Ligand binder design. Structure first.
Ligand SMILES: Nc1ncnc2c1ncn2[C@@H]1O[C@H](COP(=O)(O)OP(=O)(O)OP(=O)(O)O)[C@@H](O)[C@H]1O
Ligand SMILES: Nc1ncnc2c1ncn2[C@@H]1O[C@H](COP(=O)(O)OP(=O)(O)O)[C@@H](O)[C@H]1O
Ligand SMILES: Nc1ncnc2c1ncn2[C@@H]1O[C@H](COP(=O)(O)OP(=O)(O)O)[C@@H](O)[C@H]1O
Ligand SMILES: [Mg+2]
Ligand SMILES: [Mg+2]
Lengths: 92, 468, 493, 464
């Protein structure tokens, strides 16, 4: 279930990255021209910077998750082979 | 001419016979365990010819107490079970012994449990809808009369409750014969079902065959065949419509895998026997309607660890006409029956069979739920207010739709205190047509949870303040 | 003349002592009509895969050798028939008069007996014919999860060949072979029924190895279908062969290899499974004119799990074939049917497998759809969006609607050309997205009824001429005047 | 002296020999299938000595029809392929049989396909650049003479045209020759490549060696070695520079894995053969510069699951010196060759090898192109009008640079009637330095398409 979970996380992170990127570009448009995606502004330009940061973080997260997923993929192949060959060796 | 036990390792026994007396494959042999506490007669099924007059057999009973060198007798035929109308109303084990009345059926005609499937020229595709009164099944996963229905799902998602619900909904008024195969499941459940059928007066029309999970692997491999032999007799000889319920057909494959390495077979992927698909195919191709002779079969299929890519359920999928897939994720939300509407399927969910209205409403429901699943991650991280207004409308509709696919089922009263309900197909189609159009968006989503039709919806909404 | 003796037997395998002159892959006759194939030969015995009724094998049975490798009957009498992998009818319609016999393992056409794939094989599916065209002699993989519509795509392709069949012209006709491996019998029966309703059994043969068949039959069925098709291919005919599914054949071969104790590799497959599929699929070829110019187009089907295309068998077959149509359940549930992922699906033959008119109309489809996918996140707004990007978004939505298609409804290439013309020349811009499909169909019917010479021009010349183009535009504008939208708005200009 | 077949298990054949006649490891043995339909001569490669005068071999052809006990002849040598000038313009299989003209080459000198890399003393201690004359390659991703280049490219991005270009350029600029190794070659694509090279008239300069997909794993494993043996003959005996194409190197690794499985070896991580690195090293270390002549290899690499940490691509990339990614995006703009200037890379694009000015110009070009790539999404959605004046100037300059990386290729003459250009490296560096400085901003964009150096740009500018 580790690989299934990692794939689900990768899908979620991809959707988030797409949304944040669209928000960043729309905030760029609205700069030339309530909500909480403005970063530390409460604590358009600020939303643009916050969405840039968020989409970059989503990209970093996708890369890390993909690395972990590929490690799990390789480990699963190796383990499955180990079980198959262990059984075959037992019978041989 | 009798054989002698040579090797014993768990449920696998090697038997040596005199030259020229080696039993045929699948023949039943008899050996005696004379130890007092466990004294019994073992039935061994010949699995392989090892050469040099040795045969490898699978025991149907526990081999504790069995001794090397004991005599082994070849019955000359395979395992055979009583057939005929007499079996209706009684409980049997994999070998054909009556449990509720020992000795009953010993004089019936006996059929070998090993049989070839019907000839291909006798097969006719079945496309008649079998209405159940369950909203989700009728709308999205319509069952087929004389077709092959399965309920897939991980451990404890509601396969058995759904099987009992379909026994209540289909078998109660069925004009034909019912066969139930308990395959490697809980003995408590078997007793519960026996008592429930007696209570509903459905037992007199039902033959029950049980090989439960405490039985050795041989019994779990052959009990499905025994029940199927009874059903095949009813289909082929008596010429009546048959209802076949199997719970759980995965246990047949699992029992095969438990002994595969002891039979000397190199393991396949994921630890399964190399002959997974072939043995499954023999068994499943026997489970079928033929031209003019109907078997409506419903099988519960366990999905190990909720992994629908596991080889056992993946191989099973190709054998069904309709598949209700139960999801742990849906279960954990409290949605019952925990059907995954996006993953379930039916070969008759097509405009030609169900009609344009049914098909269009079903496709719209599926589209909305798919879009909602696409949006869930965004809603979780960024919140719902960041969605478009149209997507917010879709999310509200989807939450109401997914709740309205849940239903209070009769067989679930014991788990909720609430009596079940039945929704006619026409009401289901009209209600979900209205839901997809947004006609109930003014009601709280909680009004749609565990109810029947639109009258129940109006009542529940009133009880929560709103009005339909 | 030599006789072997069964020394042991289990799980569809039997070992035979003797038979010193048996060949590798020779057919062996066991008592009672039972057949086996000699696979493992060693100094002790022959490991034989039994091809059915394995339960009759007993230690000590005498075994005869036929002196022949596996072979099947071949000829025109197989059209319209259902046969098992040995070429024996299973439909109950009587004997099949064979023209000759073909050994299953006859070598593929060599690298110098071929010619470049250049003729279209029209599937009738706009998504495929426009985005991943298939030529004659090509191998196009149909790959995807269960219930993504793979069989439907292949059945529609077979159905689309009926008009070619009715021409009577062998250089236009396509004879079809459908190989069913590991399916339940009623499913094969429903495929046959769908073909019968479309008048396709006139030119289609089915090779059936249902799930109840011995692993040997599931292993052999693709090669039987291939041999039947090769007989036609080498006689100047054009053949389309569908394998449904090659994953089932690989599973059966793995079962055999494990039962014969051959060393396993990744996913327990033997070291020659890639070879199984590659030697199967390289027999689909376009022959040089010196050899009659016949061809066999391959449509292997692969079922992925959880859309895992990096799994072993999918990786093998993807590498082997000349292009892949990927089908996806998410797209299916979204209503994109056929559920082809246009972004990742590819045809390495490409425009060489399209007529000129299709090349012209479909040229911008890939870029338009990629742009539309890029802008899909911005639909929520469609505002503060550059007018060019908003237009790209609207056009892409209409094109996606244009590539949808109902089941069992293949389109002639001329009708596809006109539909793609509607989409890509801007004629759907004024039409509501929800009406696009209807518009298309209605328009096509109109053209079929009143201006059928546009279709005739495209079909005869393979080009949409300028005069035909302006006639079509005029017809479209008049039809728009006549069309009634779903929202009641006007689709005029 | 002859052996006899004892066991047949798919492509694995066990052969018994008399006590003093056991063949050496990797020796080629011959056996006859006499059955009429499948009659042929099997070649077996000795893989193991099992004891008792029994050897285990891999059959280079399918063993259907083989009978136990048939005679097996030891050739006394490993697989040997014809070598010499006679191999140019012909197609061979891994065993050295000519496919376009059976019987051709039997009389040539034959070389064993198993050879050592050059000794340590004979290897060059300084890496050198291979100047192709193509601007994008020479400037951004310079090729190493005797090095290895990965080629990444999907369908229809000019990969075949780039290969034809490299064949042309090695043949003319360097007086060299080319060997194409189709490892796991699709037969349709092998025929297409043969016909296309004949039409482009570069076939006479190339030797094609195909180990086709429908062959057992042994030939797919050995075809790379056969092709490399022809290349080694050209380098070492003819004193030529050789370009060795290998499509696809992953299929070599996978054929090795399959053979390892058939021979019963326990798989290593991710199911690859335990000797993965050793096999790759034995192949790649023979592709080197030695005695003043080099074999330079361009190798198509498939990356399983797009996972560059997968053992096969990781082992391959341990030997690669540069990467050329052909991009659909660049192709769709009419820019040829369709090299992705940002994705592609080279291990010798550093000052210590190419010099400070080359490195400076290349880094500036890369910085400009990366800025443009970043600005592209804003351009596409919001629109160009929303960019600052500096952003617009950067975009215009980057469009001119990116278009000037195209070039009229020698292979392109067959499509477009104009002949190709070879641009000296100094001229390329000067030109792109100027373009970075903006000295050609006033020129129209369409004037930077498919030309050579500054003289071509001037002539085209005046023409527009
Ligand atoms: N173009 C289409 N439009 C609508 N429904 C379709 C279309 N193509 C297929 N379907 C439906 O989708 C479902 C899946 O079709 P099909 O059985 O051909 O797919 P598959 O991927 O081959 O499935 P399986 O896993 O059963 O082999 C069936 O209900 C079929 O009717
Ligand atoms: N329709 C339902 N309504 C309420 N609870 C249910 C329903 N179905 C299942 N459950 C709960 O989930 C449990 C699992 O059901 P069961 O069918 O036994 O699982 P399995 O899938 O293992 O057969 C039940 O014992 C019950 O408590
Ligand atoms: N430098 C170029 N000049 C002109 N046309 C080219 C160039 N490179 C590629 N093409 C065109 O692009 C098409 C695909 O290129 P090619 O490499 O032959 O195909 P593939 O990469 O699929 O093998 C060719 O038909 C060719 O006409
Ligand atoms: Mg249960
Ligand atoms: Mg299918």
């Amino acid at each position: 279930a580790t690989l299934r979970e990692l794939r689900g996380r990768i899908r979620s992170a991809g959707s988030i990255k797409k949304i944040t990127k669209a928000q960043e570009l729309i905030a760029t448009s609205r700069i030339a021209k309530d909500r909480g995606l403005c970063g530390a502004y409460n604590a358009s330009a600020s939303r643009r910077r916050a969405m840039k940061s968020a989409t970059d973080n989503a990209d970093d997260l996708i890369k890390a998750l993909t690395l972990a997923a590929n490690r799990e993929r390789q480990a699963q192949i190796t383990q499955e082979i180990s079980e198959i060959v262990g059984g075959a060796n037992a019978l041989a | 001419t009798a054989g002698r036990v040579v090797r014993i390792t768990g449920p696998v026994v090697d038997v040596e016979f005199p030259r020229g007396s080696v039993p045929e494959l699948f023949n039943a042999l008899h050996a005696e365990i004379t130890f007092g506490a466990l004294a019994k007669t073992l039935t061994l099924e010949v699995a392989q010819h090892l050469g040099d007059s040795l045969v490898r057999c699978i025991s149907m009973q526990p081999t504790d107490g069995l001794v090397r060198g004991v005599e082994v007798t070849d019955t000359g035929a395979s395992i055979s079970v009583p057939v005929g109308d007499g079996v209706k109303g009684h409980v049997f084990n994999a070998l054909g012994d009556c449990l509720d009345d020992p000795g009953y059926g010993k004089d019936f005609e006996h059929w070998s449990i090993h049989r070839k499937p019907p000839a291909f020229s006798d097969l006719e595709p079945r496309t008649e809808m079998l209405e159940t009164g369950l909203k989700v099944v009728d709308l999205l996963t319509p069952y087929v009369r004389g077709g092959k229905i399965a309920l897939f799902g991980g451990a404890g998602v509601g396969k058995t409750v759904l099987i009992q619900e379909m026994i209540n909904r289909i078998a109660r008024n069925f004009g034909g014969t019912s066969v139930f195969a308990g395959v490697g499941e809980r003995t408590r459940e078997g007793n519960d079902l026996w008592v429930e059928l007696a209570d509903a007066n459905v037992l007199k029309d039902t033959a029950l065959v049980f090989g439960q999970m405490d039985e050795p692997p041989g019994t779990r491999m052959r009990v499905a065949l025994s029940a199927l032999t009874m059903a095949e007799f009813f289909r082929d000889e008596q010429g009546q419509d048959v209802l076949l319920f199997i719970d759980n057909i995965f246990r047949f494959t699992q029992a095969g895998s438990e002994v595969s390495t002891l039979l000397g077979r190199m393991p396949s992927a994921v630890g399964y026997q190399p002959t997974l698909a072939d043995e499954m195919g023999e068994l499943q191709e026997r489970i079928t309607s033929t031209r003019g002779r109907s078997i409506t079969s419903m099988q519960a299929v366990y999905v190990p660890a909720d992994d629908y890519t596991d080889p056992a359920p993946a191989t099973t999928f190709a054998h069904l006409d309709a598949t209700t897939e139960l999801s742990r994720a849906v279960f954990s939300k409290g949605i019952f029956p925990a059907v995954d509407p996006l993953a379930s399927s039916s070969t008759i969910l097509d405009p030609a069979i169900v009609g344009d209205e049914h098909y269009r409403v079903a496709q719209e429901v599926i589209r909305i739920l798919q879009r909602y699943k696409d949006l869930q991650d965004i809603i979780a991280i960024l919140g719902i207010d960041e969605l478009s207004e149209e997507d917010k409308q879709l999310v509200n509709r989807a939450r109401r739709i997914e709740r309205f696919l849940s239903q209070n089922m009769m067989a679930a009263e014991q788990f909720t205190g609430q009596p079940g309900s039945t929704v006619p197909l026409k009401e289901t189609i009209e209600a979900f047509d209205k839901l997809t159009k947004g006609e109930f968006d003014h009601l709280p989503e909680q009004a749609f949870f565990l109810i029947g039709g639109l009258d129940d919806l109006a009542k529940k909404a009133e009880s929560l303040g709103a009005k339909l | 003349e030599e006789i072997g003796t069964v020394i042991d037997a289990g799980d569809g395998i039997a070992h035979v002592e003797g038979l010193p002159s048996v060949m590798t892959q020779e057919l062996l006759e066991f008592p009672g009509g039972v057949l086996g194939v000699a696979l493992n030969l060693d100094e002790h015995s022959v490991g034989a895969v039994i091809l059915g009724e394995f339960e009759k094998i007993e230690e000590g049975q005498q075994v005869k050798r036929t002196g022949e490798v596996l072979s099947v009957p071949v000829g025109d009498a197989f059209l319209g028939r259902v046969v098992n992998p040995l070429g024996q009818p299973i439909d109950g319609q009587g004997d099949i008069a064979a023209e000759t016999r073909r050994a299953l393992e006859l070598q593929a056409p060599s690298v110098v007996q071929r010619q470049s794939v250049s003729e279209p094989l029209q599937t009738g599916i706009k998504a495929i014919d426009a985005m991943t065209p298939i030529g004659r002699g090509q191998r196009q993989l149909i790959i995807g999860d269960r219930k993504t519509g793979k069989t439907a795509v292949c059945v529609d392709t077979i159905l689309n060949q009926r008009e070619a069949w009715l021409t009577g012209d062998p250089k236009q006709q396509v004879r079809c072979v459908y190989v069913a491996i590991g399916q339940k019998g009623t499913t094969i029966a429903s495929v046959k029924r769908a073909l019968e309703e479309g008048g396709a059994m006139e030119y289609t043969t089915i090779v059936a190895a249902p799930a109840s068949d011995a692993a040997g039959f599931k292993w052999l069925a693709p090669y039987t279908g291939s041999a039947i098709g090769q007989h036609w291919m080498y006689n100047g005919k054009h053949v389309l062969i569908v394998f449904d599914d090659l994953s089932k054949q690989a599973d059966a071969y793995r079962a055999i290899s494990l039962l014969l104790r051959r060393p396993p590799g990744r996913e327990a497959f033997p070291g020659d499974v890639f070879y199984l599929h590659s030697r199967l699929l390289e027999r689909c070829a376009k022959l040089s004119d010196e050899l009659g110019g016949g061809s066999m187009t391959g449509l292997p089907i692969i079922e992925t799990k959880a859309n895992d295309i990096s799994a072993f068998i999918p990786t093998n077959v993807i590498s082997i074939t000349d292009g892949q149509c990927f089908l996806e359940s998410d797209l299916f549930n979204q209503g994109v049917r056929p559920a082809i992922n246009v972004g990742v699906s590819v045809s390495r033959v490409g425009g060489a497998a399209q007529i000129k008119a299709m090349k012209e109309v479909a040229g911008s489809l890939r870029l338009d759809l990629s742009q539309y996918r890029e802008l899909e996140a911005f639909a929520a707004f469609a505002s503060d969006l550059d007018a060019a990007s908003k237009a790209q978004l609207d056009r892409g939505a209409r094109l996606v609607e244009l590539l949808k298609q109902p089941q069992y409804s293949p389109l002639a290439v001329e009708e596809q050309v006109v539909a793609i013309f509607l989409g890509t020349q801007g004629h759907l811009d004024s039409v509501p997205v929800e009406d696009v499909q209807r518009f298309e169909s209605e328009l096509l019917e109109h053209v079929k009824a009143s201006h059928s010479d546009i279709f005739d021009g495209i079909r005869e010349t393979k080009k949409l001429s300028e005069e035909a183009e302006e006639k079509l535009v005029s017809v479209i504008n008049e039809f728009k005047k006549g069309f009634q939208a779903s929202d009641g708005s006007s689709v005029v200009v």
